[model samples]
Target: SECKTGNGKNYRGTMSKTKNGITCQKWSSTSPHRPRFSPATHPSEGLEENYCRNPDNDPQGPWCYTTDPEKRYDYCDILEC
Candidate 1:
Protein backbone atom coordinates (compact mmCIF):
# COMPACT_ATOMS: atom_id res chain seq x y z
CA SER A 1 0.00 0.00 0.00
CA GLU A 2 2.88 2.35 0.74
CA CYS A 3 4.05 1.96 -2.80
CA LYS A 4 0.76 3.23 -4.11
CA THR A 5 -0.61 6.76 -4.04
CA GLY A 6 -4.14 7.91 -3.17
CA ASN A 7 -6.34 9.16 -5.93
CA GLY A 8 -6.96 12.70 -4.61
CA LYS A 9 -8.57 11.35 -1.46
CA ASN A 10 -6.18 9.90 1.09
CA TYR A 11 -2.75 11.37 0.59
CA ARG A 12 -0.43 10.61 3.50
CA GLY A 13 0.87 14.16 3.94
CA THR A 14 1.67 17.47 2.32
CA MET A 15 4.45 18.93 0.18
CA SER A 16 4.46 22.59 1.09
CA LYS A 17 5.81 25.85 -0.29
CA THR A 18 7.65 28.08 2.17
CA LYS A 19 6.37 31.43 3.50
CA ASN A 20 8.66 33.02 0.94
CA GLY A 21 8.44 31.72 -2.63
CA ILE A 22 12.11 31.28 -3.54
CA THR A 23 12.99 27.74 -2.39
CA CYS A 24 10.67 24.75 -2.73
CA GLN A 25 10.23 21.18 -1.58
CA LYS A 26 11.72 18.55 -3.75
CA TRP A 27 9.78 15.29 -3.55
CA SER A 28 11.95 12.43 -2.45
CA SER A 29 11.20 9.69 0.02
CA THR A 30 14.49 10.61 1.66
CA SER A 31 13.62 14.33 1.76
CA PRO A 32 12.30 16.24 4.73
CA HIS A 33 8.63 17.02 5.28
CA ARG A 34 7.91 20.70 4.82
CA PRO A 35 5.96 23.26 2.83
CA ARG A 36 7.00 22.52 -0.72
CA PHE A 37 5.01 22.15 -3.94
CA SER A 38 3.53 18.83 -4.86
CA PRO A 39 0.77 18.47 -7.39
CA ALA A 40 -0.30 15.33 -5.59
CA THR A 41 -0.48 16.58 -2.01
CA HIS A 42 -1.38 20.26 -2.32
CA PRO A 43 -1.48 21.47 -5.88
CA SER A 44 -0.91 25.12 -6.70
CA GLU A 45 -3.28 26.89 -9.10
CA GLY A 46 -0.47 28.26 -11.25
CA LEU A 47 0.76 24.71 -11.27
CA GLU A 48 -2.75 23.65 -12.16
CA GLU A 49 -2.87 26.16 -15.01
CA ASN A 50 0.60 25.19 -16.17
CA TYR A 51 3.08 22.81 -14.52
CA CYS A 52 6.12 24.29 -16.22
CA ARG A 53 5.67 27.57 -14.36
CA ASN A 54 7.11 25.98 -11.22
CA PRO A 55 10.80 25.07 -11.17
CA ASP A 56 10.34 22.59 -8.36
CA ASN A 57 7.75 20.74 -10.39
CA ASP A 58 9.32 21.01 -13.83
CA PRO A 59 12.22 18.62 -13.29
CA GLN A 60 9.81 15.78 -13.94
CA GLY A 61 9.08 17.23 -17.33
CA PRO A 62 5.82 18.79 -18.59
CA TRP A 63 2.46 17.62 -17.41
CA CYS A 64 -1.10 18.83 -18.01
CA TYR A 65 -2.95 20.36 -15.06
CA THR A 66 -6.08 18.77 -13.76
CA THR A 67 -9.03 20.67 -15.23
CA ASP A 68 -10.80 20.80 -11.86
CA PRO A 69 -10.08 24.16 -10.21
CA GLU A 70 -10.36 24.57 -6.42
CA LYS A 71 -10.48 27.52 -4.02
CA ARG A 72 -7.89 25.97 -1.71
CA TYR A 73 -5.26 26.79 -4.30
CA ASP A 74 -4.50 30.53 -4.16
CA TYR A 75 -0.86 30.27 -5.28
CA CYS A 76 -1.85 28.56 -8.48
CA ASP A 77 -1.57 31.76 -10.45
CA ILE A 78 1.55 33.18 -8.74
CA LEU A 79 4.41 32.25 -10.96
CA GLU A 80 6.86 33.34 -13.73
CA CYS A 81 5.08 36.69 -13.94
Candidate 2:
Protein backbone atom coordinates (compact mmCIF):
# COMPACT_ATOMS: atom_id res chain seq x y z
CA SER A 1 0.00 0.00 0.00
CA GLU A 2 1.03 3.58 -0.60
CA CYS A 3 2.33 5.49 2.39
CA LYS A 4 -0.42 8.03 2.25
CA THR A 5 -1.23 10.37 5.09
CA GLY A 6 -4.55 10.42 6.84
CA ASN A 7 -7.01 12.81 5.18
CA GLY A 8 -4.33 13.93 2.75
CA LYS A 9 -3.07 16.47 5.25
CA ASN A 10 0.09 18.47 4.60
CA TYR A 11 1.86 21.30 6.35
CA ARG A 12 4.35 24.02 5.56
CA GLY A 13 7.35 24.71 7.72
CA THR A 14 9.35 27.89 8.17
CA MET A 15 10.98 29.77 5.32
CA SER A 16 14.68 30.20 4.71
CA LYS A 17 17.07 31.56 2.10
CA THR A 18 18.98 29.14 -0.05
CA LYS A 19 22.67 29.32 -0.89
CA ASN A 20 21.76 30.89 -4.23
CA GLY A 21 20.10 33.82 -2.43
CA ILE A 22 16.60 32.58 -3.22
CA THR A 23 13.86 32.14 -0.64
CA CYS A 24 12.36 28.70 -0.09
CA GLN A 25 9.91 26.91 2.17
CA LYS A 26 9.76 23.44 3.63
CA TRP A 27 6.73 21.31 2.84
CA SER A 28 5.91 18.27 4.94
CA SER A 29 3.60 15.54 3.77
CA THR A 30 1.83 12.92 5.79
CA SER A 31 2.89 9.79 3.93
CA PRO A 32 6.60 10.56 3.95
CA HIS A 33 8.60 12.08 6.73
CA ARG A 34 10.99 13.61 4.28
CA PRO A 35 10.41 17.26 3.44
CA ARG A 36 10.83 19.18 0.19
CA PHE A 37 11.85 22.72 -0.59
CA SER A 38 10.16 25.03 -3.07
CA PRO A 39 10.52 28.58 -4.25
CA ALA A 40 8.91 31.08 -1.95
CA THR A 41 6.25 32.53 -4.20
CA HIS A 42 2.50 32.65 -4.22
CA PRO A 43 1.37 32.73 -7.84
CA SER A 44 -2.15 31.63 -7.15
CA GLU A 45 -3.66 34.44 -9.20
CA GLY A 46 -1.69 34.00 -12.44
CA LEU A 47 1.61 32.76 -13.79
CA GLU A 48 2.95 36.29 -13.74
CA GLU A 49 1.66 36.86 -10.25
CA ASN A 50 4.63 36.02 -8.10
CA TYR A 51 5.22 36.94 -4.49
CA CYS A 52 9.01 37.08 -4.97
CA ARG A 53 9.66 40.49 -6.41
CA ASN A 54 12.11 41.16 -9.18
CA PRO A 55 15.70 42.24 -8.68
CA ASP A 56 16.96 45.81 -8.34
CA ASN A 57 15.88 48.39 -10.93
CA ASP A 58 13.81 45.88 -12.88
CA PRO A 59 10.04 45.95 -13.18
CA GLN A 60 8.96 43.80 -16.12
CA GLY A 61 11.73 41.26 -15.73
CA PRO A 62 13.26 38.97 -13.10
CA TRP A 63 10.18 36.95 -12.44
CA CYS A 64 9.99 34.12 -9.90
CA TYR A 65 12.49 31.27 -10.29
CA THR A 66 12.64 27.54 -9.64
CA THR A 67 15.50 25.06 -9.23
CA ASP A 68 16.01 21.34 -8.66
CA PRO A 69 19.08 19.43 -7.56
CA GLU A 70 18.57 15.80 -8.63
CA LYS A 71 16.26 16.55 -11.57
CA ARG A 72 13.59 14.44 -9.94
CA TYR A 73 10.68 16.27 -11.50
CA ASP A 74 9.24 18.39 -8.71
CA TYR A 75 6.54 20.53 -10.26
CA CYS A 76 3.54 22.18 -8.66
CA ASP A 77 0.51 23.72 -10.37
CA ILE A 78 -1.63 24.30 -7.31
CA LEU A 79 -0.06 27.73 -6.90
CA GLU A 80 0.27 28.39 -10.61
CA CYS A 81 -1.06 31.78 -11.49
Candidate 3:
Protein backbone atom coordinates (compact mmCIF):
# COMPACT_ATOMS: atom_id res chain seq x y z
CA SER A 1 0.00 0.00 0.00
CA GLU A 2 1.02 3.63 -0.63
CA CYS A 3 0.42 7.08 0.83
CA LYS A 4 -2.14 9.52 -0.54
CA THR A 5 -1.06 12.56 1.48
CA GLY A 6 2.24 14.47 1.46
CA ASN A 7 3.15 12.71 4.64
CA GLY A 8 1.72 9.28 5.53
CA LYS A 9 -0.20 10.47 8.56
CA ASN A 10 -3.20 8.95 6.81
CA TYR A 11 -1.37 5.82 5.67
CA ARG A 12 -2.89 2.76 7.22
CA GLY A 13 -0.91 -0.02 5.53
CA THR A 14 0.54 -2.98 7.39
CA MET A 15 4.08 -2.63 6.02
CA SER A 16 6.05 -3.70 9.03
CA LYS A 17 9.35 -3.05 7.30
CA THR A 18 11.58 0.01 7.03
CA LYS A 19 13.14 1.44 3.89
CA ASN A 20 16.41 -0.21 4.93
CA GLY A 21 14.63 -3.58 4.71
CA ILE A 22 14.49 -4.01 8.45
CA THR A 23 11.41 -5.26 10.23
CA CYS A 24 9.89 -2.55 12.40
CA GLN A 25 9.87 -2.60 16.18
CA LYS A 26 6.37 -2.91 17.45
CA TRP A 27 4.83 0.35 18.60
CA SER A 28 3.58 -1.50 21.63
CA SER A 29 6.92 -3.21 22.26
CA THR A 30 9.59 -1.46 24.27
CA SER A 31 12.20 -4.18 24.32
CA PRO A 32 14.80 -3.47 21.65
CA HIS A 33 13.81 0.18 21.72
CA ARG A 34 11.37 2.46 23.47
CA PRO A 35 9.99 5.30 21.47
CA ARG A 36 8.26 8.47 22.55
CA PHE A 37 5.68 7.73 19.87
CA SER A 38 3.37 4.85 20.53
CA PRO A 39 -0.24 3.68 20.49
CA ALA A 40 -0.69 4.78 24.08
CA THR A 41 0.69 8.32 23.67
CA HIS A 42 -0.37 9.01 20.11
CA PRO A 43 -3.39 6.86 19.54
CA SER A 44 -4.82 9.28 16.98
CA GLU A 45 -1.60 9.02 14.99
CA GLY A 46 -2.44 5.36 14.32
CA LEU A 47 0.71 3.92 15.86
CA GLU A 48 -0.48 0.39 15.48
CA GLU A 49 1.73 -2.68 15.87
CA ASN A 50 4.99 -2.42 13.91
CA TYR A 51 3.46 -0.95 10.83
CA CYS A 52 5.10 2.12 9.29
CA ARG A 53 3.34 5.35 10.18
CA ASN A 54 4.10 9.07 9.99
CA PRO A 55 2.83 9.81 13.44
CA ASP A 56 5.04 12.89 13.70
CA ASN A 57 4.10 13.87 10.16
CA ASP A 58 7.59 13.57 8.73
CA PRO A 59 7.76 15.37 5.43
CA GLN A 60 9.13 12.37 3.57
CA GLY A 61 6.67 9.61 4.47
CA PRO A 62 5.83 6.85 6.86
CA TRP A 63 8.49 5.35 9.11
CA CYS A 64 8.99 3.38 12.30
CA TYR A 65 11.44 2.57 15.05
CA THR A 66 13.53 -0.37 13.83
CA THR A 67 14.16 -3.70 15.45
CA ASP A 68 17.84 -3.15 14.72
CA PRO A 69 19.37 -0.70 17.15
CA GLU A 70 22.20 0.08 14.76
CA LYS A 71 19.73 2.18 12.90
CA ARG A 72 17.30 3.96 15.12
CA TYR A 73 14.70 4.54 12.42
CA ASP A 74 14.07 4.98 8.70
CA TYR A 75 11.31 5.99 6.37
CA CYS A 76 9.17 3.34 4.74
CA ASP A 77 9.21 2.84 0.98
CA ILE A 78 5.70 4.11 0.57
CA LEU A 79 4.94 5.59 -2.83
CA GLU A 80 3.01 8.79 -3.31
CA CYS A 81 -0.53 8.92 -4.63
Candidate 4:
Protein backbone atom coordinates (compact mmCIF):
# COMPACT_ATOMS: atom_id res chain seq x y z
CA SER A 1 0.00 0.00 0.00
CA GLU A 2 0.94 3.62 -0.57
CA CYS A 3 0.24 6.84 1.31
CA LYS A 4 -0.45 9.91 -0.78
CA THR A 5 0.63 13.20 0.68
CA GLY A 6 -1.07 16.55 0.16
CA ASN A 7 1.67 17.48 -2.29
CA GLY A 8 0.55 14.55 -4.44
CA LYS A 9 3.69 12.51 -3.89
CA ASN A 10 2.88 8.85 -3.39
CA TYR A 11 4.85 7.21 -0.62
CA ARG A 12 4.89 3.49 -0.41
CA GLY A 13 5.82 1.09 2.39
CA THR A 14 6.35 3.96 4.82
CA MET A 15 4.71 6.97 6.38
CA SER A 16 5.38 10.65 6.94
CA LYS A 17 4.33 12.64 9.99
CA THR A 18 4.20 16.13 8.54
CA LYS A 19 4.73 18.24 5.49
CA ASN A 20 8.39 18.44 4.41
CA GLY A 21 9.10 15.61 6.82
CA ILE A 22 10.63 12.78 4.84
CA THR A 23 10.68 9.41 6.47
CA CYS A 24 13.22 7.00 5.07
CA GLN A 25 11.86 3.52 4.63
CA LYS A 26 13.16 0.14 3.58
CA TRP A 27 13.15 -0.55 -0.16
CA SER A 28 13.15 -4.25 0.48
CA SER A 29 11.22 -6.45 2.91
CA THR A 30 14.57 -7.21 4.54
CA SER A 31 16.90 -4.42 5.52
CA PRO A 32 15.76 -0.87 6.15
CA HIS A 33 19.03 0.73 5.09
CA ARG A 34 19.87 -1.26 2.00
CA PRO A 35 20.27 0.60 -1.25
CA ARG A 36 17.75 0.09 -4.00
CA PHE A 37 18.96 -1.23 -7.32
CA SER A 38 19.72 1.55 -9.75
CA PRO A 39 21.52 1.95 -13.02
CA ALA A 40 24.03 4.16 -11.29
CA THR A 41 27.24 2.55 -10.17
CA HIS A 42 28.34 2.34 -6.56
CA PRO A 43 31.25 4.69 -5.91
CA SER A 44 32.57 2.87 -2.88
CA GLU A 45 32.22 -0.92 -3.08
CA GLY A 46 31.39 -1.00 -6.75
CA LEU A 47 28.08 -2.29 -8.11
CA GLU A 48 27.21 -5.79 -6.94
CA GLU A 49 24.35 -7.34 -8.88
CA ASN A 50 22.34 -9.81 -6.84
CA TYR A 51 19.07 -11.65 -6.27
CA CYS A 52 17.03 -12.62 -3.17
CA ARG A 53 14.83 -15.51 -2.16
CA ASN A 54 12.49 -16.41 0.69
CA PRO A 55 12.72 -20.18 0.82
CA ASP A 56 11.53 -20.17 4.40
CA ASN A 57 8.27 -18.49 3.42
CA ASP A 58 7.87 -16.19 6.42
CA PRO A 59 6.18 -12.95 5.41
CA GLN A 60 6.38 -9.60 7.19
CA GLY A 61 9.87 -10.35 8.34
CA PRO A 62 13.41 -9.52 7.31
CA TRP A 63 14.62 -11.91 4.63
CA CYS A 64 18.13 -12.37 3.35
CA TYR A 65 19.26 -12.52 -0.27
CA THR A 66 22.08 -14.00 -2.28
CA THR A 67 24.52 -11.82 -4.12
CA ASP A 68 26.79 -12.55 -7.00
CA PRO A 69 29.47 -15.10 -6.01
CA GLU A 70 27.37 -15.77 -2.86
CA LYS A 71 27.94 -13.97 0.46
CA ARG A 72 26.06 -12.40 3.37
CA TYR A 73 26.39 -8.77 4.39
CA ASP A 74 24.47 -6.11 6.32
CA TYR A 75 23.65 -4.05 3.23
CA CYS A 76 22.12 -5.42 0.04
CA ASP A 77 23.05 -4.65 -3.56
CA ILE A 78 19.46 -4.82 -4.78
CA LEU A 79 16.60 -4.06 -2.42
CA GLU A 80 12.92 -4.89 -2.80
CA CYS A 81 10.29 -2.24 -3.33
Give the higher-lDDT candidate: 2 or 3. 3
Provide the lDDT at 44 for model 2.
Answer: 29
lDDT of 4 by residue, 1-81 (tens): 332223222212223121222222322423434444322532232122222222222343222332221233222122234
Runs in model 2 with CA error above 4 Å?
1-15, 29-81
Ranking by lDDT: 3, 1, 4, 2
User: For candidate 2, which ten residues in a row score worst on lDDT?
Assistant: 2-11
Superposed by TM-score, candidate 2 places the C-alpha of residue 9 at a distance from the truth, in angstroms, of 27
Tens-place lDDT per residue, model 2, 37-78, is 223332221222222222222323222233343322222212
Could you estimate the TM-score for every candidate?
0.19, 0.18, 0.88, 0.18
Candidate 1 residue-wise lDDT, 1-81, digit = tens: 111131222222222332233233233221333224555665542333222233233433222222222212222222121
Question: lDDT of each prediction vs. the true structure?
Answer: 0.29, 0.26, 0.84, 0.27
lDDT of 3 at 58: 82
Task: Using TM-score, give the best candidate's number.
Answer: 3
For model 3, the superposed segments whose C-alpha errors exceed 4 Å read none
Which candidate, 1 or 4, has the higher TM-score? 1
Using lDDT as the measure, name the better of candidate 1 and candidate 3.
3
Candidate 1 lDDT for residue 8: 20
